[PDB]
Design a protein around this motif. Structure first.
Motif: not given
Lengths: 72, 72
Positions: A15-16, A25-26, A42-44, A55-58
């Motif tokens: 994914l970009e 959003n992801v 569920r994302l791990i 967010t991703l940066s977090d």
């Protein structure tokens, strides 16, 4: 930046994304590609479940990071 | 000729097809039987993903062949 998501069946999706992208959003991007509704995903990452309001940066997710997708 | 399609849940479906049938046509037959939209289905045979613009004969699929169905 590009990231990777692995499925329970051994499939890997690329994914970009931007560090400012939200987890929700992801999930939405995954829905578009695989047809899996966000409420069933569920994302791990590094053993931690990612929340839809963060967010991703977090989570200090960097380029070429691999996330794991779980189905409920 | 008859063919078999196995699901991720361990279910086996039997379909009646002709070597000249297209993969898209096969997906359509699965939709009719299981209610799964063709855009959410991925068909694999002997380790290869089958394309919607090709036919069964192109993949040398013979009577009593077993295909694998993947969901996205």
């Amino acid at each position: 930046m590009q990231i990777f998501v692995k499925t329970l069946t051994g499939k890997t999706i690329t994914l970009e994304v931007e560090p400012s992208d939200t987890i929700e959003n992801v999930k939405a991007k995954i829905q578009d590609k695989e047809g899996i509704p966000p409420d069933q995903q569920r994302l791990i990452f590094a053993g931690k479940q990612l929340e839809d309001g963060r967010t991703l940066s977090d989570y200090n997710i960097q380029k070429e990071s691999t996330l794991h997708l779980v189905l409920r």
